[PDB]
Write a protein that binds this ligand. Structure first.
Ligand SMILES: Cc1cc2nc3c(=O)[nH]c(=O)nc-3n(C[C@H](O)[C@H](O)[C@H](O)COP(=O)(O)OP(=O)(O)OC[C@H]3O[C@@H](n4cnc5c(N)ncnc54)[C@H](O)[C@@H]3O)c2cc1C
Ligand SMILES: CCCCCCCCCCCCCCCCCC(=O)OC[C@H](COP(=O)(O)OCCN)OC(=O)CCCCCCCCCCCCCCCCC
Ligand code: HEM
Ligand SMILES: CCCCCCCCCCCO[C@@H]1O[C@H](CO)[C@@H](O[C@H]2O[C@H](CO)[C@@H](O)[C@H](O)[C@H]2O)[C@H](O)[C@H]1O
Ligand SMILES: COc1[nH]c(=O)c(C(=O)[C@@H](C)C[C@H](C)[C@@H](Cl)CCl)c(O)c1OC
Ligand SMILES: O=C([O-])CC(=O)C(=O)O
Ligand code: SF4
Ligand code: F3S
Ligand code: FES
Ligand SMILES: [K+]
Lengths: 139, 612, 102, 240
């Protein structure tokens, strides 16, 4: 006697004005590697975009060209370890997001959806991210 | 006074959302009846969803079939205690009922020709019993009831049926021998609701939970059967409890008879397919009352399996693994979960288990509840019943496999068809008393604030353990009377009940106390009907009266036989009454309907010898 | 368009495949063609990406409107600053190389 | 010789004025209990605390009543083995991010309503010959339904999906979406394009980002994540 849309409306109207609590979710749900890698793919994507936007804003607002700021950092005569740590920290989120992005595109084709394959592809992304970030930072 | 009471008005109210309640519900809405559906569970949680083997119909997809052969197998399977007019209607309407379900989207398994797959099932034959095993059990692998109930629920979303989910029906609203509706309890908010209607349909399932071990769900407490009892109305043939042969050992979960229908065999401790000795022709596909007795005899005679010699083996590993995965994927998973068994390697430990109640609310072939007054069948005005809660009686003393799911959709539709031809929508709904059903609310509040000596869980176990030992596969008057004295004492000790949850919103402590009241009303009529019936017919097997007593002796020629009077033979229905206050059980008897709906189209089968 | 949601889902995947191919393009063929293609792809992919985060996490008529407008300002400024860097400065490809020569 | 196991269970009573959610611990002797968690819940209710409220029925994992969060994951209490490690206390919560009616009993009516909205029943452009003959379906086209029709609507998958946590008012969830796909590829259905057209909005379908919590938690072993991916591929391919 009630349509689906009407049932959904009464649900929210009944519950939101009630004294009923909301069952816990994120604080009690057990994590997994695919789930941790899903939200990490989101955090890396957002961090990369904000990094691009801070760069574009710097090109419009800073009084010096890019070669000037590279010359300033080079004149600081930093150690190869700090240069490596900086390079690794810059290229790690990009590399992870790229490999896990290819993993997402494979999923969008409908491939690799068996749960054991989800775990396999995730671990492969993890070791490919490390190997790529280690080789790139070494350059 | 203390409980807020809400009143409703409908053309008809259906109590139950199983396969039978749903078919009647939107069938009434199909016919323009403003219909309400009251169910204590969400519809797809009903025990129908657990059904596995399939549903019978003479479609003829595997071989040339004939619904009259299905009629014959059902009459013979019932041990001539079933009403042949109802069996006629069910077996003739079976092809249309299954075709309707498939047309609803039911994902039946398919044959090479694209038609509905049908497997063999216990006690079904061709050529009126002289043509060998039949294959008319239409199935969805071994998840037929799951797909049946989900298909019916989906179909019911198209109609204007007003659902009341998780409402617990307390009693009927009776006035001057007529049913005005039902009074129920809303579990979500704790309010009492009186539903007024010109016609009430009762499809509340069985009461298999009266026993300790049973394949039934925890919600199969015979709630509708007790409402009819509290209304001063009779129940029929309640002492005939079907014991399924292959209920898994331990958890009691069902292992489908389709296992034997696909080629599975039963094995004792010495590796013998012992059914070749009890039923040389039918073997493991004999009737369920025969197999359950055969397996029970092998156990007590010392040929049981396991470390306690208390069960037997169902062997499937001789069947190809591709067949096991296609035809029986459900029990493959279940045998692993509840027994650690790999069906491709080891057999399943099985033993007889309470499964189905042949008895229930007596109706006719139209679905109308009847009472017996001075030898005539009085139709109760406005009261209907269908499914396992009702006694058509299409199953008599023993039900054939895959016939209940048929009973549900045939007589669910029949109730809606009978109401449509007898009454019209929008007719003035009958009035009730201002305090109608207040005895239900008083009994509800009494149990809610119980403060006695015995808790509800402790009382339910004393009932289940009493039924399990005193009303098992074999029964004796000395043992049945001991169980009758125990049950009649447990019922009088319900005054000393003890509940804890003093709330009303989702008070499962209170609801399961009401279900105990309903279980006890059904359990008394069962063990007292079994004690009085001094014969062996179908499932009810008395070892002190091993014979079947009909009005004649159909093992000898009827030439000049002295006909036994109705008071001396036993081919008759048991009608049980219960004084709810004291608990005393009263028993009456009404004759079996041997006539069909058309003798020239379906010959009435006279009682004969019953062997497999 | 009655298929606007599915056409957008396809475009998101298409731009990701395009952006994926620009990484070997930037390493193998650095120059203005890849700098500006990177500028357009990094902005469009990031804009659609941050929109999904807003759709998932921001609720209410006004907060959704405020977030999507503020995101549109961020994207437009980002694409313009990237084009400014490509035309007036060394460009994306050369900036990455100079940064890695440190 | 008793093996005492500790369970920590969510408790809330709507009839207590001012009642606040809490956790209560129960000690269950595993030598006098069934192997499944539901056997412990029923033992606790029948022996220790009869006020503990929860949904149960089939106790064999077919009806879907006893869905809850056991040891951090959504599962059926009747097919979830009790952890025999007595040094670990099993935490039992209701289904996550759901309004609590009482104790472990959530409100599934929005979940039910979303399932109704996708019209989960066979539809034909011509329904005049309904009930006359059986619809022909090849064994091949019937096999396409394996892994889909077995769904018991327990709601474990949807209540484990983060997108359903934040947008359950508009995201249909993996359970309903897979049932929609079950009717999309049913060869006997004539409304495939209409079912796809229903999902042309940013929320109904496209809030799924392939997190795959749903497939991990399904007590029936189904893959609603893969089904959603097949819908998405169908959404991008069908012509009108
Ligand atoms: C494990 C198992 C497997 C089976 N397999 C098969 C098979 O393969 N083939 C076959 O033919 N038969 C089979 N059967 C038998 C058959 O499935 C059942 O007898 C039949 O499904 C019962 O259906 P029903 O609609 O009468 O009631 P059920 O399906 O049991 O449902 C009862 C309904 O009544 C409602 N109800 C009960 N009490 C109340 C109350 N107080 N207030 C409101 N509502 C109430 C409940 O909400 C529920 O929805 C099987 C039985 C079992 C237990
Ligand atoms: C910034 C984070 C990622 C850094 C990746 C570093 C890649 C790199 O170092 O490329 C070097 C390449 C020149 O390489 P080559 O001439 O062989 O010299 C090697 C010794 N420096 O330099 C090039 O010519 C290619 C530059 C590639 C540019 C990639 C653009 C990525 C845009 C997204 C960045 C998000 C932050
Ligand atoms: C430089 C890049 C930037 C700034 C960037 C930014 C983003 C952002 C902000 C998101 C949104 C995250 C989310 O929705 O959870 C996202 C998602 C995504 N990115 Fe990138 N990205 C970059 C590179 C790449 C590459 C090289 C690939 C390949 C890729 C593939 C994807 C995919 C497939 C998604 C969708 C994630 C989902 O649907 O859940 N990205 N990106
Ligand atoms: C940038 C790197 C990305 C983030 C990395 C985060 C690393 C920690 C993530 C949390 C891992 O948490 C852990 O994950 C594993 C793998 O799914 C889970 O394993 C679980 O599933 C796997 C199969 O899928 C089973 O084999 C195993 O018996 C079971 O415990 C485990 O229950 C969980 O405790
Ligand atoms: C890819 O999309 C997603 N992937 C996820 O893993 C995901 C999640 O896993 C959430 C439980 C993450 C939660 C919001 C964190 Cl920040 C609290 Cl500590 C999430 O919310 C999400 O967005 C809908
Ligand atoms: O009861 C029936 O009709 C069939 C049944 O449970 C089975 O599959 O064994
Ligand atoms: S997909 Fe699995 S978890 Fe989700 S409702 Fe269906 S059976 Fe339950
Ligand atoms: S967990 Fe949720 S995001 Fe998608 S793949 Fe499963 S419905
Ligand atoms: S009770 Fe039916 S699923 Fe656990
Ligand atoms: K019956």
């Amino acid at each position: 006697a009630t349509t689906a849309k009407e049932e959904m409306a009464r649900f929210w109207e009944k519950n939101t004005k009630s004294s009923r609590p909301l069952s816990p979710h994120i604080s009690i749900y057990k994590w997994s590697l695919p789930m941790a890698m899903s939200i990490t793919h989101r955090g890396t994507g957002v961090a990369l975009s904000l990094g691009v936007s801070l760069f574009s804003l710097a090109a419009l607002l800073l009084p010096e060209q890019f070669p000037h700021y590279v010359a300033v950092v080079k004149s600081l005569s930093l150690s190869p370890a700090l240069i490596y740590s900086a390079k690794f920290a810059l290229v790690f989120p990009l590399s992870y997001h790229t490999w896990n992005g290819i993993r997402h595109l494979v999923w969008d084709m409908g491939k690799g959806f068996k749960l054991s394959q989800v775990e396999q592809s995730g671990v492969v992304v993890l070791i490919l991210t490390l190997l790529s970030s280690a080789a790139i930072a070494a350059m | 006074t203390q409980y807020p009471v809400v009143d409703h008005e409908f053309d008809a109210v259906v109590v139950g959302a199983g396969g039978a309640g749903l078919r009647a519900a939107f069938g009434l809405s199909e016919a323009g009846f403003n219909t309400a559906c009251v169910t204590k569970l969400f519809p797809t949680r009903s025990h129908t969803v657990a059904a596995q083997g399939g549903i019978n119909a003479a479609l003829g997809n595997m071989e040339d079939d004939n619904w009259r052969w299905h009629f014959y197998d059902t009459v013979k399977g019932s041990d001539w205690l079933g009403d042949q007019d109802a069996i006629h209607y069910m077996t003739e309407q079976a092809p249309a009922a299954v075709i309707e379900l498939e047309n609803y989207g039911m994902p039946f398994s398919r044959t090479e020709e694209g038609k509905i797959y049908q497997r063999a099932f216990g006690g079904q034959s061709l050529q009126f019993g002289k043509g060998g095993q039949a294959h008319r059990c239409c199935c969805v692998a071994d998840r037929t009831g799951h797909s049946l109930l989900h298909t019916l629920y989906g179909r019911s979303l198209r109609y204007d049926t007003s659902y009341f989910v998780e409402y617990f029906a307390l009693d009927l609203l009776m006035e001057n021998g007529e049913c005005r509706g039902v009074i129920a309890l809303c579990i979500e908010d704790g309010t009492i609701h009186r539903f007024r209607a010109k016609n009430t349909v009762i499809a509340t399932g069985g009461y298999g939970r009266t026993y300790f071990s049973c394949t039934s769900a925890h919600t199969s407490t015979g709630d509708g059967t007790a409402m009819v009892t509290r209304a001063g109305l009779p129940c029929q043939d309640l002492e005939f409890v079907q014991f399924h042969p292959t209920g898994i050992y331990g958890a009691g979960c069902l292992i489908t008879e389709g296992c034997r229908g696909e080629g599975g065999i039963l094995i004792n401790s010495q590796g013998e397919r012992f059914m070749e000795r009890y039923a040389p022709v039918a073997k493991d596909l004999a009737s369920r009352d025969v197999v359950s007795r055969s397996m029970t005899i092998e156990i007590r005679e010392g040929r049981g399996c396991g470390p306690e010699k208390d069960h037997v083996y169902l062997q499937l590993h001789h069947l190809p693994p591709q067949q096991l995965a296609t035809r029986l994927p459900g029990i493959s998973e279940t045998a692993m979960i509840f027994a650690g068994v790999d069906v491709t390697k080891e057999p399943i430990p099985v033993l007889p288990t309470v499964h189905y109640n042949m008895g229930g609310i007596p109706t006719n072939y139209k679905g109308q509840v009847i009472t017996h007054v001075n030898g005539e069948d009085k139709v109760v005005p406005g009261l209907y019943a269908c499914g396992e809660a009702a006694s058509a009686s299409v199953h008599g003393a023993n039900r054939l496999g895959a016939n209940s799911l048929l009973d549900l959709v045939v007589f669910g539709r029949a109730c809606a068809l009978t109401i449509a031809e007898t009454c019209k929508p929008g007719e003035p709904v009958p009035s009730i008393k201002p305090n109608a059903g207040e005895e239900s609310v008083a009994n509800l509040d009494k149990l809610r604030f119980a403060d006695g000596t015995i808790r509800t869980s402790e009382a339910r176990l004393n009932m289940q353990k009493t039924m399990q030992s005193h009303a098992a596969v074999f029964r004796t008057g000395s043992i049945l009377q001991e169980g009758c004295e125990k049950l009649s004492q447990i019922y009088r000790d319900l005054a000393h009940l003890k509940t804890f949850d003093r709330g009303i919103v989702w008070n499962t402590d209170l609801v399961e106390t009401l279900e105990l009241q309903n279980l006890m009303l059904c359990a008394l009529q069962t063990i007292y009907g079994a004690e009085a019936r001094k014969e062996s017919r179908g499932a009810h097997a008395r070892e002190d009266y091993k014979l079947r007593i009909d009005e004649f002796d159909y093992s000898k020629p009827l030439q000049g036989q002295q006909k036994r009077p109705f008071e001396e033979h036993w081919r008759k229905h048991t009608l049980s009454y219960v004084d709810v206050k004291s608990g005393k059980v009263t028993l009456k008897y009404r004759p079996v309907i041997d006539r069909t709906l058309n003798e020239e189209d379906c010959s009435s089968v006279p009682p004969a010898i019953r062997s497999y | 368009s009655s298929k606007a949601a599915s056409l957008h889902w396809t475009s998101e995947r298409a731009v990701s495949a395009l952006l994926l191919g620009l990484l070997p393009a930037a390493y193998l063929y650095p120059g203005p063609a890849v700098d500006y293609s990177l500028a357009a792809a990094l902005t469009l992919h990031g804009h659609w990406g941050l929109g999904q985060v807003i759709t998932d996490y921001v609720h209410g008529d006004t907060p959704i409107k405020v977030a999507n407008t503020g995101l549109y300002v961020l994207s437009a400024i980002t694409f313009t600053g990237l084009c400014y860097f490509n035309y007036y400065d060394v460009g994306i490809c050369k900036a990455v190389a100079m940064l890695w020569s440190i | 010789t008793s093996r005492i196991k500790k369970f920590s269970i969510y408790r809330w009573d709507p009839d207590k004025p001012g009642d606040k959610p809490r956790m209560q611990t129960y000690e269950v002797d595993l030598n006098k209990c069934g192997p499944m968690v539901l056997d412990a819940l029923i033992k606790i209710k029948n022996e220790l605390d009869s006020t503990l409220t929860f949904r149960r029925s089939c106790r064999e994992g077919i009806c879907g009543s006893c869905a809850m969060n056991i040891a951090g994951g959504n599962t059926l209490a009747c097919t979830k083995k009790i952890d025999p490690d007595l040094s670990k206390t099993t935490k039992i919560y209701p289904l996550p991010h759901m309004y609590v009616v009482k104790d472990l009993v959530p409100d599934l009516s929005n979940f039910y309503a979303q399932y109704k909205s996708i019209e989960p029943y066979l539809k034909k452009k011509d329904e005049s010959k309904q009930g006359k003959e059986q619809y022909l379906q090849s064994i091949e086209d019937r096999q396409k339904l394996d892994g889909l029709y077995e769904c018991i609507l327990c709601a474990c998958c949807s209540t484990s999906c983060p997108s359903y946590w934040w947008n359950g008012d508009k995201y249909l969830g993996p359970a309903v979406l897979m049932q929609a796909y079950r009717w999309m590829i049913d060869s006997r259905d004539d409304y495939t394009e209409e079912r796809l057209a229903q999902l042309q909005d940013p929320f109904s379908l496209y809030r799924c980002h392939t997190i795959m919590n749903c497939t991990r938690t399904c007590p029936k072993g189904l893959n609603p994540g893969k089904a959603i991916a097949e819908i998405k591929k169908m959404m991008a391919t069908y012509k009108e």
